[PDB]
């Protein structure tokens, strides 16, 4: 059991160490999203000619 | 009866001086066991991959 439980620990840091990268990896998918959102925003308004939405 | 008791007492010896051997061989028996239990509660975790398996 102590070795066992030892080893869980282990493997549940292991399970946090991988879920950081993914919910760190997000992080920069939200922030491409803002800006995403922000240029679609830009590109909404009809002051704007063909040359200015490419 | 005296030399007979003498002998059953060396043959009893004789006894308890082989089940050490045999004793203390399945401690490392034991030994092993608790690090295949170890080894194989740390590859159970699906956050290995296939080389960190074998």
């Known amino acids: 059991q102590v070795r066992g439980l030892n080893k869980a620990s282990d493997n549940a840091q292991d399970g946090v160490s991988l879920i950081q990268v993914a919910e760190g990896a ?29």
Chains 1, 2 share one sequence.
């Open 26 to 54: 997000l992080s920069e998918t939200h922030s491409i999203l803002q800006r995403m959102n922000e240029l679609a925003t830009q590109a909404a308004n009809d002051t704007n000619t063909t040359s200015d939405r490419t």
